[PDB]
């Protein structure tokens with residue numbers, strides 16, 4: 001069937017509540033639900049469900065002119081009232097959206113007519129339109145499908161305006177989507193997509209090799225990277241590797257001994273041979289990262305000085321800080337306390353485990369004892385929220401989150417970045433500057449504030465950047481060139497054109 005594809009995903013798409021998070025998969029929310037404005041690779045948005053808009057001089061009041069031709073997939077109209085009712089449902093769960101400053105900025109949303117939607121903002125939020133374009137939460141379900149006039153307590157049928165409709169979901173087996181035959185926009189060439197739930201990366205590779213699936217699309221965890229490299233040479237297969245999309249790093253706990261010491265954090269940043277880690281654990285498929293954000297990220301081309309692999313410098317930094325080797329021992333001590341750091345990761349994640357083992361060995365060569373704490377996902381997210389880690393694997397979010405929304409989230413105490421940064425004397429100033437950079441009209445001041453925030457975070461060695469990772473594709477050649485979406489978390493299935 002040449003206009004039907006089978007793919008895989010590690011989990012089900014979820015119930016496709018447009019306004020909630022796990023277990024909803026963003027790529028699947030973005031398939032069914034649409035924004036007012038669509039994010040583009042150059043960082044702009046274009047008109048989408050909103051054909052046009054205007055703002056007050058002070059930048060706090062916006063009016064969107066909506067399309068008049070859009071139906072939800074169930075036949076009900078998309079109008080300003082449906083849109084307004086969606087904003088109300090989202091903002092009734094305001095606490096859950098703390099990470100997204102647009103959710104704390106929206107003062108009012110009301111339909112002025114069937115086609116005029118007015119949004120009022122606490123201040124002049126410069127990322128306003130980029131945050132409306134995100135997969136969640138500012139997308140539109142048919143208000144008939146609200147439960148008890150809310151979404152925060154669940155939805156009925158996942159009815160969107162989007163080019164795909166969820167046909168059916170079977171927990172731990174599959175999800176099936178079909179083309180919306182009544183879409184306001186252009187119909188995708190593909191009519192049906194089946195997602196096989198395949199949690200294990202090796203099992204996903206095997207499913208592709210047996211012909212059970214047609215397409216794999218994901219980040220560096222999509223399949224074993226040695227297998228990907230082999231598939232890239234196999235003339236029966238098609239593979240792709242994007243330009244990098246986001247950073248994988250360690251977050252170092254500035255509020256916990258011994259990562260509370262700047263000198264320890266700087267040493268750890270000289271300890272890791274990232275090129276060898278990538279060649280060894282990532283089969284040479286990813287790029288070395290020297291900074292929290294790649295220099296290509298908006299506002300992040302700052303000429304920050306990288307900490308290159310330099311075990312001699314790492315040892316000298318630890319020696320100068322009073323961390324010295326006892327007579328014939330490999331682990332440094334200070335005040336009789338050994339230099340012992342815990343590295344927390346998802347213990348079933350083979351790639352995390354491999355990287356953690358390379359980081360443990362490199363750090364032992366400079367006299368740091370890294371204990372590996374491999375735990376189930378829930379325990380690792382628990383550690384992240386409450387700062388119960390020495391070092392923890394972490395990652396940035398890609399476009400269009402990086403850097404504004406990733407920085408924004410550093411102020412939220414239930415997030416890894418706040419907890420990692422909590423020991424910094426400058427943390428109150430950093431959080432103040434993050435607030436200011438998001439609200440400032442003054443473009444010169446916005447750049448200076450981003451420079452200050454990212455320079456402090458760099459100089460304080462809060463992170464150990466490892467890699468700028470890429471999206472990867474494995475496909476049956478008959479599917480053709482597989483496009484990438486501007487938004488890192490989306491998959492542009494409607495652009496696939498065998």
Ligand SMILES: O=C(O)CN(CCN(CC(=O)O)CC(=O)O)CC(=O)O
Nearest residue numbers: 021022026099136137396397401489
């Ligand atoms: O996942 C969440 O609950 C909220 N996100 C906010 C940032 N998310 C966007 C989202 O989930 O909507 C980026 C991401 O999940 O990639 C926190 C996180 O992933 O660390």
Ligand SMILES: [Cl-]
Nearest residue numbers: 220221223224
């Ligand atoms: Cl992998």
Ligand SMILES: [Fe+3]
Nearest residue numbers: 021022026397
């Ligand atoms: Fe998230």
